[PDB]
RNA sequence: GCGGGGUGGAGCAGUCAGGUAGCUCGUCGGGCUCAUAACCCGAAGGUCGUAGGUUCAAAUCCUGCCCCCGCAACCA
RNA sequence: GGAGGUAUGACAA
């Protein structure tokens, strides 16, 4: 549809774009302001001219598979050089100084009470 | 089939109340009890269950045709009065009330006390 | 729409008991008094006089009237 | 099978008959087990115990005749098993009907502005 | 408390319906002392009732209360090894308390998106003697009738 | 050689009569208690000894094989 | 008022 993702047809454009990996709320507003598409129109109402303008606008940004490879390469590098952060990534522990005696469940996964 | 005078026997114990309406000759005509109205356990011993039992037996008794009964009350149950009044309410004419609690003039040895 | 129809009496009771435990909404029609009791109806809609009502032995009152 | 009476009488007569049949099959099984238990005891005894081996074969003959006159219990007809579970979860408003009127072409309107939730 | 009954603080009447009951309803719907939101919900819902029905909303609400306010309640009593419920008559103050609590509690559980819509629908249903709040009253009376054997208590 | 047995930690069902693996106690985690026991609530623990067959599908039926237990393995 | 009768819990401190 836009970057290889069928954005929700019923939602307003600002939000529908957010379903693209690499587009958040602020970035969606920027691309619509550049193209000149009102933020309140449902994307089902987008005309081929408006959609292509959005696609042209989005093609400038790094999104979806391009972004995912970029971030994974960063983490890959941290692991390869053997940095402290890389080990945190590889062992599934918080990487930004958070204490692990408690919590850290997002990184660790579900509790293993054993 | 059709009666005019009768007697209502209220067998009220601690556990249950049975109401039995006979003719004056002691032939049964209709009967109810707390147990036969769905009451179970302690509920069977309450005055209300005694009241309901009297009603259900009274209405059946008056279906046969029966105006006035005398009441014989027996046992230590709490529901004797609630049955006696329920008889009056549902349609019967309670003419006389007697206590026929058996009393041994001594008699047999009662069972042991319920502890030890 | 009349689920217990054509079913043997044993299967009817099985049908009613299992529906009672069903964890979902049930729109049922049944002229069998036993089947509706097992399901434990909550609201009854009377016809032709539209009357969304709480289920109760007042169902008999509507049947009489 | 034809009974005299009503449905309950049929159930009462039938339930009793199947009960009396069940008890018959139970006692026939006990006697078979008894012979079987002795036949095995003789079967595993020393070959030098001639009389027990003899008695074991004699009871093996009775055991065979028992097993051939042993009534089979009719397999009780299996009842339906239903386990209806929803894949997804119900909402607070599963169905919305608002001001619905319907008539079969050529017939009086069945309901007018029918609305329930 | 042990000393005895306490003073019950009075509530002032609703500004537009001149009803203390309306103020009591507003307090029941209120959350975190946000009375402005509570009042808006009640007044919007009385306008919804004024639309779905041609009658005075205050009249409809009072009719809903008549169908919801219980008369007999079950009071748990612990006697020895058996704890059973004793039927009890509900004093008039608690009657409106239960009615307001039930109407509000079941409106919050309704399916409509907004509370005032949920509250208006719950009010109108109760005014017609149907819905969850009426069913709560029916069950409460059903429980007392079953335990009517313990009336002498 | 004649029988009996292999299903969760243990003891048992289900096996005849094929469809969906449980019950009893125990174990672990949390409650309740000043604490322990009892009690309450949650969880875990077996693809049914093992490998082939039959079948739409087997713990179940068939067959083999390995294990464990009571007998027997010779009588004048 | 008074009188005869009708589950578990070391040892020392
Ligand atoms: K840390
Ligand atoms: K913590
Ligand atoms: Mg996005
Ligand atoms: Mg820190
Ligand atoms: Mg004894």
XYZ file of C-alpha atoms (C1' of nucleotides) and ligand atoms in Angstrom:
659
model
C 0.000 0.000 0.000
C 2.558 2.592 1.099
C 5.787 0.821 2.085
C 4.663 -2.770 1.659
C 2.151 -2.532 4.515
C -1.643 -2.417 4.195
C -2.229 0.575 6.460
C -5.676 0.588 8.136
C -8.184 1.904 5.618
C -10.734 3.210 8.139
C -8.380 5.297 10.299
C -7.243 8.878 9.796
C -4.014 9.236 7.839
C -1.873 10.444 10.747
C -2.579 7.239 12.654
C -2.726 4.824 9.712
C 0.812 5.838 8.782
C 1.948 4.946 12.309
C 1.319 1.295 11.400
C 4.429 1.620 9.225
C 7.585 0.537 11.033
C 9.693 3.676 11.422
C 6.764 6.135 11.376
C 5.557 7.433 14.722
C 3.013 10.075 15.627
C 5.416 12.974 15.081
C 6.860 11.591 11.836
C 3.383 11.032 10.391
C 2.502 14.679 11.015
C 5.709 15.795 9.297
C 5.156 13.768 6.119
C 1.534 14.901 5.795
C 2.534 18.538 6.287
C 5.203 18.177 3.594
C 2.881 16.482 1.096
C -0.025 18.758 1.997
C -2.634 16.170 3.036
C -5.073 17.090 5.780
C -4.597 15.037 8.931
C -8.317 14.333 9.403
C -9.083 12.537 6.116
C -9.597 8.790 6.331
C -7.087 7.004 4.130
C -9.967 5.347 2.276
C -10.590 8.862 0.930
C -6.986 9.366 -0.223
C -6.810 9.912 -3.972
C -4.133 8.286 -6.101
C -2.414 11.673 -6.270
C -2.410 11.978 -2.473
C -1.330 8.368 -1.907
C 1.555 8.657 -4.369
C 2.654 11.899 -2.717
C 2.709 10.039 0.607
C 4.633 7.164 -0.970
C 7.109 9.627 -2.469
C 7.434 11.315 0.925
C 7.855 8.016 2.781
C 10.358 6.650 0.260
C 12.720 9.369 1.504
C 12.688 7.913 5.025
C 14.235 4.670 6.279
C 11.362 2.362 7.243
C 10.217 -1.250 7.559
C 12.812 -3.820 6.442
C 15.471 -1.171 5.910
C 15.061 0.087 9.479
C 14.920 -3.408 10.988
C 18.196 -4.438 9.354
C 19.772 -1.170 10.508
C 18.872 -1.718 14.165
C 19.723 -5.425 14.141
C 23.135 -4.579 12.695
C 23.720 -2.211 15.615
C 22.925 -4.931 18.154
C 24.942 -7.435 16.127
C 27.935 -5.106 16.403
C 27.609 -4.751 20.175
C 27.683 -8.537 20.529
C 30.582 -9.018 18.103
C 32.922 -6.582 19.875
C 32.118 -8.242 23.201
C 30.979 -5.041 24.876
C 29.097 -5.086 28.162
C 25.922 -4.066 26.336
C 26.370 -6.872 23.813
C 26.525 -9.455 26.598
C 23.385 -7.948 28.101
C 21.730 -8.401 24.701
C 22.952 -11.978 24.338
C 22.001 -13.061 27.874
C 18.571 -11.393 27.850
C 19.150 -8.843 30.626
C 18.538 -5.085 30.846
C 21.135 -3.143 28.876
C 20.730 0.372 30.335
C 21.833 -0.059 33.939
C 18.504 -1.243 35.355
C 18.646 -3.410 38.456
C 17.930 -7.099 37.911
C 17.420 -8.382 41.464
C 13.752 -7.539 40.879
C 11.674 -6.804 37.779
C 13.633 -7.061 34.485
C 10.752 -9.259 33.321
C 10.503 -7.583 29.913
C 14.044 -8.698 29.086
C 14.054 -11.978 31.022
C 10.678 -13.301 29.900
C 8.054 -15.027 32.038
C 8.903 -15.880 35.628
C 10.537 -19.289 36.138
C 9.594 -19.884 39.768
C 11.756 -23.028 39.885
C -65.695 -38.093 50.770
C -67.592 -35.322 52.578
C -67.052 -34.554 56.273
C -68.290 -31.860 58.646
C -66.320 -32.438 61.879
C -62.739 -33.559 62.334
C -59.538 -33.357 64.354
C -56.095 -32.036 63.386
C -53.120 -33.819 64.964
C -50.039 -31.588 65.179
C -47.073 -33.916 65.766
C -44.383 -31.279 66.348
C -40.932 -32.532 67.363
C -37.590 -30.738 67.563
C -36.598 -31.947 64.088
C -39.846 -31.840 62.100
C -43.558 -31.060 62.294
C -46.240 -33.357 60.872
C -49.836 -32.138 60.556
C -52.520 -34.802 60.117
C -56.224 -34.013 59.728
C -58.624 -36.877 60.411
C -62.346 -37.154 60.863
C -63.585 -37.361 64.442
C -63.170 -41.159 64.265
C -59.418 -40.914 63.660
C -59.554 -41.881 59.981
C -57.018 -39.806 58.073
C -58.316 -37.344 55.482
C -55.264 -35.241 54.606
C -51.797 -34.663 55.998
C -48.701 -32.591 55.369
C -45.369 -32.040 57.066
C -42.466 -29.633 56.854
C -40.401 -32.354 55.199
C -42.886 -32.912 52.378
C -42.900 -29.210 51.410
C -39.192 -29.230 50.520
C -37.885 -28.096 53.908
C -34.655 -29.847 54.905
C -32.582 -29.791 58.068
C -33.159 -27.127 60.696
C -35.710 -25.408 58.451
C -38.119 -28.299 59.047
C -38.200 -27.356 62.746
C -39.075 -23.667 62.350
C -42.501 -22.117 63.018
C -42.827 -21.071 59.374
C -42.350 -24.634 58.138
C -44.991 -25.632 60.680
C -47.218 -22.886 59.270
C -46.770 -24.033 55.672
C -47.405 -27.653 56.647
C -50.699 -26.710 58.302
C -51.809 -24.738 55.236
C -51.046 -27.441 52.676
C -52.882 -30.020 54.784
C -55.764 -27.650 55.547
C -56.526 -26.833 51.913
C -56.543 -30.515 50.954
C -58.805 -31.190 53.938
C -61.318 -28.524 52.896
C -61.318 -29.799 49.316
C -62.976 -32.905 50.749
C -65.449 -30.650 52.554
C -64.739 -30.064 56.240
C -65.754 -27.045 58.300
C -64.613 -27.318 61.932
C -61.777 -29.322 63.512
C -60.438 -29.651 67.031
C -56.676 -29.615 67.538
C -54.521 -32.051 69.506
C -50.974 -30.771 70.044
C -48.094 -33.139 70.788
C -44.356 -32.734 71.185
C -41.907 -29.987 72.173
C -41.484 -28.449 68.719
C -41.479 -24.683 68.358
C -44.071 -24.748 65.564
C -47.212 -25.843 67.422
C -48.859 -22.409 67.443
C -47.841 -21.436 63.906
C -49.657 -24.591 62.803
C -52.695 -23.920 65.007
C -53.126 -20.393 63.645
C -52.403 -21.500 60.075
C -55.385 -23.847 60.378
C -57.642 -20.910 61.247
C -56.223 -18.745 58.459
C -56.600 -21.157 55.547
C -60.302 -21.684 56.261
C -60.873 -24.140 59.096
C -62.782 -23.407 62.312
C -60.604 -24.434 65.265
C -63.074 -25.256 68.043
C -60.881 -26.836 70.738
C -57.173 -27.236 71.474
C -55.789 -30.015 73.671
C -52.323 -31.166 74.711
C -51.789 -34.908 74.312
C -48.061 -35.059 74.993
C -47.481 -38.619 76.267
C -46.186 -38.694 79.840
C -44.803 -41.889 81.435
C -46.021 -42.380 84.994
C -42.573 -43.340 86.272
C -41.939 -46.046 82.591
C -39.125 -46.934 80.219
C -35.549 -45.768 80.646
C -34.782 -42.894 78.232
C -31.653 -42.991 76.050
C -28.347 -41.699 77.357
C -27.496 -38.009 77.574
C -26.006 -36.747 74.318
C -22.480 -36.249 75.702
C -20.086 -38.678 77.374
C -34.677 -22.951 17.191
C -36.254 -25.814 19.156
C -33.036 -27.794 19.750
C -34.523 -30.665 21.757
C -36.976 -31.563 18.985
C -36.579 -35.113 17.631
C -34.120 -35.963 20.422
C -34.663 -38.880 22.774
C -35.380 -37.882 26.391
C -31.888 -38.854 27.554
C -30.194 -36.738 24.882
C -32.436 -33.763 25.688
C -31.212 -33.615 29.287
C -27.616 -33.869 28.066
C -28.260 -31.015 25.631
C -29.779 -28.778 28.293
C -27.101 -29.454 30.897
C -24.225 -28.746 28.507
C -25.797 -25.537 27.197
C -26.196 -24.342 30.786
C -22.400 -24.453 31.100
C -21.863 -22.804 27.704
C -19.737 -19.675 28.143
C -21.577 -17.611 25.564
C -24.815 -15.957 24.548
C -27.788 -18.199 23.757
C -30.834 -17.094 21.768
C -33.160 -20.073 22.135
C -36.709 -21.038 21.198
C -38.247 -24.027 22.955
C -41.756 -25.265 23.722
C -40.279 -27.898 26.060
C -40.629 -26.659 29.669
C -37.889 -28.980 30.942
C -35.246 -27.824 28.457
C -35.619 -24.120 29.258
C -35.360 -24.787 32.998
C -32.032 -26.589 32.584
C -30.576 -23.764 30.486
C -31.651 -21.245 33.128
C -33.091 -18.451 31.012
C -32.286 -14.853 31.987
C -34.490 -12.666 29.753
C -37.557 -13.732 27.772
C -38.897 -11.896 24.710
C -42.642 -12.413 24.306
C -44.415 -12.430 20.947
C -46.347 -11.070 19.207
C -46.612 -8.387 21.903
C -42.973 -7.324 22.093
C -41.968 -7.523 25.757
C -38.305 -7.803 26.745
C -38.688 -9.168 30.273
C -36.605 -10.781 32.986
C -37.119 -14.538 32.998
C -39.235 -15.962 35.815
C -42.275 -18.177 36.528
C -44.127 -15.163 35.139
C -43.496 -16.951 31.839
C -46.553 -18.981 32.841
C -48.515 -15.753 33.315
C -47.725 -14.707 29.742
C -48.684 -18.170 28.487
C -52.043 -17.913 30.255
C -52.583 -14.433 28.794
C -40.478 -55.788 24.862
C -44.084 -54.907 25.700
C -45.147 -53.853 29.200
C -48.512 -53.083 30.766
C -48.748 -49.653 32.354
C -47.135 -46.267 31.721
C -43.649 -44.911 31.058
C -42.599 -45.003 34.713
C -43.793 -48.600 35.048
C -41.684 -49.501 32.012
C -38.651 -47.802 33.552
C -39.256 -49.549 36.880
C -39.721 -52.971 35.280
C -36.784 -52.441 32.920
C -34.353 -51.108 35.531
C -35.128 -54.080 37.778
C -34.658 -56.593 34.963
C -31.266 -55.168 33.984
C -30.323 -55.153 37.670
C -31.318 -58.801 38.071
C -29.457 -59.647 34.857
C -26.351 -57.804 36.061
C -26.312 -59.761 39.323
C -26.582 -63.041 37.408
C -23.543 -62.224 35.278
C -21.600 -61.230 38.405
C -22.121 -64.595 40.102
C -21.295 -66.522 36.930
C -18.020 -64.587 36.711
C -17.119 -65.391 40.322
C -17.519 -69.128 39.746
C -15.406 -68.903 36.579
C -12.708 -66.994 38.464
C -12.789 -69.603 41.238
C -12.174 -72.490 38.839
C -9.617 -70.418 36.934
C -7.762 -69.669 40.169
C -7.547 -73.361 41.061
C -6.595 -74.418 37.533
C -3.660 -71.999 37.683
C -2.617 -73.243 41.122
C -2.459 -76.797 39.777
C -0.778 -75.600 36.575
C 2.161 -74.096 38.493
C 2.490 -76.908 41.042
C 5.367 -79.376 40.840
C 5.009 -82.113 38.231
C 5.533 -84.543 41.112
C 2.177 -83.630 42.696
C 0.175 -86.078 40.602
C -3.197 -85.698 42.331
C -3.225 -81.895 42.130
C -2.219 -82.039 38.458
C -5.045 -84.537 37.946
C -7.542 -82.301 39.748
C -6.270 -79.347 37.741
C -7.185 -81.001 34.450
C -10.589 -82.075 35.783
C -11.350 -78.489 36.792
C -10.008 -77.295 33.440
C -12.884 -79.245 31.880
C -15.433 -77.607 34.188
C -13.814 -74.226 33.544
C -14.231 -74.723 29.795
C -17.905 -75.676 30.148
C -18.491 -72.642 32.379
C -16.879 -70.200 29.948
C -19.124 -71.538 27.176
C -22.411 -70.979 29.083
C -21.434 -67.574 30.529
C -23.961 -64.928 29.505
C -22.495 -61.814 27.919
C -23.567 -58.534 29.488
C -25.138 -56.327 26.833
C -23.015 -53.263 26.156
C -24.848 -50.342 27.736
C -25.836 -47.851 25.054
C -23.474 -44.887 25.186
C -24.877 -41.427 25.874
C -23.989 -38.261 23.995
C -21.084 -36.135 25.232
C -21.126 -32.436 24.325
C -18.362 -29.941 25.146
C -19.348 -26.666 23.469
C -16.828 -23.878 24.033
C -16.522 -20.525 22.235
C -13.315 -19.727 20.392
C -13.567 -15.989 21.117
C -15.169 -13.974 23.913
C -18.594 -12.349 24.071
C -19.032 -8.577 24.192
C -21.391 -6.559 26.364
C -23.495 -5.992 23.207
C -23.361 -9.139 21.063
C -26.448 -8.270 18.998
C -28.163 -4.925 18.359
C -31.706 -4.920 16.953
C -33.202 -1.456 16.464
C -36.605 -0.529 15.028
C -36.868 -3.691 12.924
C -40.159 -4.295 11.107
C -40.821 -7.299 8.881
C -43.758 -8.779 6.983
C -43.977 -11.698 4.589
C -45.207 -10.230 1.261
C -48.996 -10.296 1.417
C -49.423 -10.931 5.152
C -49.830 -8.782 8.277
C -46.741 -7.267 9.865
C -45.406 -9.656 12.498
C -43.680 -6.967 14.580
C -43.243 -3.202 14.290
C -40.133 -1.273 15.354
C -38.812 -4.307 17.211
C -35.787 -3.198 19.241
C -33.855 -5.319 21.729
C -30.249 -5.600 22.869
C -19.742 2.524 66.240
C -20.023 1.372 69.854
C -21.251 4.671 71.312
C -24.328 4.879 69.100
C -25.890 6.299 65.946
C -24.079 9.244 64.399
C -25.240 12.428 62.693
C -26.070 12.032 58.996
C -24.954 15.071 57.005
C -27.666 16.595 54.829
C -27.279 17.131 51.081
C -28.518 20.233 49.290
C -30.981 19.993 46.390
C -29.983 19.749 42.760
C -29.722 23.244 41.207
C -31.949 22.508 38.204
C -34.251 19.685 39.375
C -34.454 20.914 42.995
C -34.148 17.325 44.228
C -31.859 16.011 46.947
C -32.148 12.584 45.316
C -30.532 13.972 42.162
C -27.625 15.243 44.262
C -27.336 11.833 45.933
C -27.237 10.209 42.491
C -24.485 12.620 41.438
C -22.414 11.675 44.487
C -22.796 7.955 43.756
C -21.534 8.370 40.187
C -18.693 10.647 41.315
C -15.098 9.419 41.168
C -12.090 11.044 42.862
C -14.091 14.083 43.944
C -14.672 15.093 40.312
C -18.187 16.392 40.833
C -18.186 18.448 37.639
C -17.904 15.274 35.577
C -20.435 13.506 37.795
C -23.005 16.283 37.397
C -22.556 16.416 33.624
C -23.236 12.679 33.319
C -26.434 12.890 35.363
C -27.728 15.976 33.549
C -26.882 14.586 30.119
C -28.635 11.337 31.028
C -31.765 13.156 32.200
C -31.752 14.922 28.830
C -31.453 11.556 27.070
C -34.443 10.323 29.070
C -36.283 13.518 28.147
C -35.653 12.489 24.521
C -36.380 8.747 24.505
C -39.422 9.600 26.645
C -41.707 12.606 26.761
C -41.975 12.521 30.547
C -40.102 14.541 33.145
C -36.756 12.746 33.679
C -37.025 13.313 37.425
C -40.339 11.446 37.281
C -38.762 8.555 35.368
C -35.873 8.353 37.835
C -38.256 8.237 40.798
C -40.211 5.453 39.095
C -36.949 3.579 38.545
C -36.198 3.934 42.261
C -39.613 2.530 43.175
C -38.819 -0.612 41.171
C -35.249 -0.954 42.466
C -35.352 0.037 46.153
C -35.604 -3.200 48.176
C -38.007 -3.853 51.038
C -36.565 -6.989 52.671
C -32.854 -7.713 53.022
C -30.923 -10.725 54.299
C -28.772 -10.066 57.375
C -26.121 -12.725 57.951
C -26.280 -14.130 61.485
C -23.721 -16.522 62.985
C -25.450 -18.963 65.355
C -23.090 -21.573 66.764
C -21.725 -23.784 64.013
C -24.327 -22.640 61.467
C -24.324 -19.231 59.760
C -27.629 -18.470 58.033
C -29.280 -15.345 56.670
C -32.086 -13.602 58.565
C -34.653 -11.518 56.631
C -34.616 -7.868 57.687
C -36.756 -4.897 56.716
C -34.749 -2.151 55.014
C -34.995 1.248 56.674
C -35.959 4.039 54.252
C -32.521 5.679 54.287
C -30.819 2.435 53.273
C -33.528 1.828 50.666
C -32.405 4.827 48.621
C -28.789 3.896 49.361
C -29.260 0.444 47.845
C -31.310 1.815 44.963
C -28.692 4.415 44.087
C -25.856 1.916 44.534
C -27.535 -0.713 42.355
C -28.650 1.644 39.584
C -25.177 3.172 39.331
C -23.266 -0.100 39.686
C -25.226 -1.847 36.931
C -25.118 1.190 34.639
C -21.319 1.059 34.779
C -21.529 -2.562 33.594
C -23.878 -1.853 30.670
C -22.657 -2.039 27.085
C -23.151 1.507 25.806
C -20.038 3.571 25.176
C -20.772 6.563 27.429
C -21.872 6.554 31.051
C -24.758 8.986 30.591
C -26.145 6.759 27.840
C -25.545 3.733 30.067
C -27.150 5.516 33.017
C -30.161 6.737 31.029
C -30.771 3.252 29.630
C -30.447 1.674 33.074
C -32.811 4.273 34.547
C -35.450 3.802 31.849
C -35.256 0.006 32.088
C -35.770 0.165 35.853
C -38.642 2.613 35.358
C -40.242 -0.142 33.256
C -39.467 -2.796 35.908
C -36.793 -4.608 33.887
C -33.010 -4.781 33.709
C -30.134 -5.705 35.978
C -31.020 -3.330 38.825
C -34.549 -4.727 39.025
C -33.119 -8.248 38.905
C -30.905 -7.387 41.877
C -34.041 -6.326 43.751
C -35.875 -9.488 42.694
C -33.022 -11.682 43.932
C -32.837 -9.780 47.221
C -36.540 -10.405 47.814
C -36.098 -13.986 46.608
C -33.365 -14.543 49.201
C -35.512 -13.129 52.009
C -38.553 -15.196 51.032
C -36.494 -18.398 51.063
C -35.084 -17.561 54.509
C -38.511 -16.456 55.755
C -38.338 -19.272 58.321
C -35.964 -17.091 60.383
C -38.371 -14.147 60.623
C -38.769 -14.537 64.391
C -35.094 -13.560 64.673
C 7.756 -73.763 31.499
C 2.703 -71.854 34.279
C 0.703 -67.074 35.871
C 0.761 -61.951 37.315
C 2.576 -57.002 36.356
C 4.892 -52.148 33.439
C 0.090 -45.054 33.155
C 2.994 -38.157 36.706
C 7.136 -38.821 43.072
C 4.537 -43.508 45.307
C -0.116 -46.456 45.404
C -4.177 -47.091 41.865
C -8.066 -46.374 37.815
C -8.983 -46.225 32.755
C -7.390 -51.809 29.362
C -12.619 -56.457 28.389
C -16.278 -52.844 25.205
C -10.807 -47.628 19.951
C -11.581 -41.521 19.992
C -11.279 -37.169 25.650
C -5.024 -39.473 30.406
C -7.107 -39.226 35.266
C -8.234 -40.274 41.302
C -5.592 -40.920 46.462
C -1.656 -39.303 49.134
C 2.748 -36.726 48.278
C 6.185 -32.591 45.892
C 6.897 -27.306 44.767
C 5.034 -21.782 45.065
C 1.805 -18.676 47.624
C -1.745 -18.011 51.824
C -3.557 -18.620 57.017
C -0.520 -19.099 62.325
C 3.884 -15.992 67.078
C 5.586 -20.770 64.906
C 4.571 -26.009 63.375
C 0.794 -29.393 62.043
C -3.965 -29.418 59.982
C -6.493 -26.190 56.336
C -7.101 -22.769 51.785
C -5.412 -21.289 46.729
C -2.305 -22.059 42.547
C 1.558 -25.017 39.750
C 4.336 -28.829 38.334
C 5.096 -33.773 37.478
C 3.470 -39.001 32.409
C 2.580 -38.644 25.230
C 0.821 -44.984 29.269
C 7.966 -50.083 29.950
C 10.102 -50.242 24.813
C 9.667 -51.199 18.891
C 6.907 -52.661 15.028
C 1.621 -53.615 13.193
C -4.206 -52.948 12.729
C -7.206 -48.512 12.136
C -9.672 -42.358 10.124
C -7.438 -42.421 15.255
C -4.488 -47.067 20.452
C -2.787 -46.140 26.909
C -6.714 -49.642 25.069
C -6.540 -54.277 19.994
C -2.300 -57.657 17.847
C 2.840 -59.232 17.883
C 7.650 -59.309 19.513
C 11.490 -57.918 22.874
C 13.737 -56.142 27.640
C 12.607 -55.677 32.823
C 10.032 -56.881 38.067
C 7.339 -60.468 41.275
C 4.955 -65.424 43.023
C 5.299 -70.925 41.220
C 7.749 -75.056 38.653
C 11.979 -77.308 36.557
C 10.569 -84.492 38.353
C 7.561 -88.345 40.461
C 8.086 -95.704 42.730
C -26.136 -12.029 98.904
C -24.665 -17.492 100.501
C -26.474 -22.735 101.394
C -27.645 -29.474 100.176
C -31.546 -30.871 95.503
C -32.446 -31.021 90.087
C -3.080 -30.903 67.989
C 1.685 -29.232 69.444
C 5.802 -25.736 71.742
C 14.947 -27.860 72.349
C 17.909 -26.743 76.787
C 20.144 -23.134 80.250
C 19.444 -18.257 81.209
K 22.075 -2.670 37.577
K 9.654 -6.426 44.524
Mg 5.055 2.958 13.386
Mg 19.843 2.561 38.560
Mg -24.902 -45.060 70.815
